[PDB]
């Protein structure tokens, strides 16, 4: 570059953009200070745009879901996974229902048959915790979205929006990210008189950082390792890092296990979401 290099950081748009701008904008400044390079957060409008901008070089480092990060790595030779939160090793979805819907707590996966004929919303089409794994667990109970009221599921686009369309009564039930649910309950952003959890899924792996190949050619030998150490180094010490980690709802970032994403890829191929 005739210019000094700049690291472009992105994230799937999985909740309110104003909240994500506070998190990733502060994280860009924190990485900038830790690395002594220019770092900018570049937002995207939907989940596929995160995959595509990563693939084409519009984003260098992205906070992906399970499904989107698998897609981004399959489409981008030499992309690496760098880290995940502590909680991403053992992630869950919550199935929620409007408390007027008559839907009862479910004690087994077989109980998901109760959602046949109901208005049900997934999150993003490409969401792991809001679509893929929920659709997987539904299919094991013998429920397909064809069986919901209207012959299909809603897609709200985000974990926040799934809470909002169940809370409003526009849908009777939905599925979303358990961390976003728990944070919204704790923060007062969900009316727990109107919405309750009917089921928590089995554990699966979900969010992780994926980095583009060849960043060492742009920023110098060792940079990608320094970037991975910067993420794994995040600690609740300064106000800035306390805020970053509270918005992630993590105590720390941890390394991933080699091919811990093979079960998410397998589900993605089973449900036709991976080419
Ligand atoms: Cl920049
Ligand atoms: Cl740039
Ligand atoms: Cl990945
Ligand atoms: Cl793909
Ligand atoms: Cl779809
Ligand atoms: Cl279907
Ligand atoms: Cl559908
Ligand atoms: Cl519908
Ligand atoms: Cl390189
Ligand atoms: Cl560091």
Numbering used by the authors: -2 to 272
From the paper:
Picocyanobacteria strains encode a putative ABC-type phosphite/phosphate/phosphonate transporter, phnDCE, thought to provide access to an alternative phosphorus pool. To understand the function of the PhnDCE transport system and its ecological consequences, we characterised the PhnD1 binding proteins from four distinct marine Synechococcus isolates (CC9311, CC9605, MITS9220, and WH8102). We show the Synechococcus PhnD1 proteins selectively bind phosphorus compounds with a stronger affinity for phosphite than for phosphate or methyl phosphonate. However, based on our comprehensive ligand screening and growth experiments showing Synechococcus strains WH8102 and MITS9220 cannot utilise phosphite or methylphosphonate as a sole phosphorus source, we hypothesise that the picocyanobacterial PhnDCE transporter is a constitutively expressed, medium-affinity phosphate transporter, and the measured affinity of PhnD1 to phosphite or methyl phosphonate is fortuitous.
Therefore, to understand the molecular mechanism of Pi selectivity, we determined a high-resolution crystal structure (2.0 Å) of Synechococcus MITS9220_PhnD1 with bound Pi, resulting in a closed ligand-bound complex. The overall structure of MITS9220_PhnD1 is similar to that of other class II substrate binding proteins (SBPs) and specifically to cluster-F SBPs, with two α/β domains separated by a longer central hinge region (8–10 amino acids). The extended hinge region in cluster-F SBPs is believed to provide greater flexibility between the ligand-bound (closed) and unbound (open) conformations of cluster-F SBPs. This hinge region encompasses a buried ligand-binding cavity and includes a Pi molecule within the MITS9220_PhnD1 structure copurified with the protein. The MITS9220_PhnD1 structure displays an unusual asymmetric distribution of electrostatic surface potential, where the front is completely enveloped by positive charge, attracting several Cl- anions from the crystallisation buffer. Within the crystal structure of MITS9220_PhnD1, the four Pi oxygens are bound by a total of 10 direct hydrogen bonds, forming an extensive H-bond network to the main chain and sidechains of residues distributed between the two domains. These include a tyrosine (Y44) at the beginning of α2; an -STS- motif (S124, T125, S126) in a loop region joining β6 and α4; a histidine (H156) at the beginning of α6; an H-acceptor aspartic acid (D203) and a capping tyrosine residue (Y204) found just before β10. A single water molecule buried deep within the cavity also contributes to this hydrogen bond network. This water molecule is further stabilised by intramolecular hydrogen bonds to residues on domain 1 (T65) and domain 2 (S123), contributing to the interactions that connect the two domains and occluding the binding pocket from the solvent. Similarly, the capping Y204 sidechain is engaged in hydrogen bonds to residues D11 (domain 1) and N174 (domain 2), contributing to the two-domain interactions.
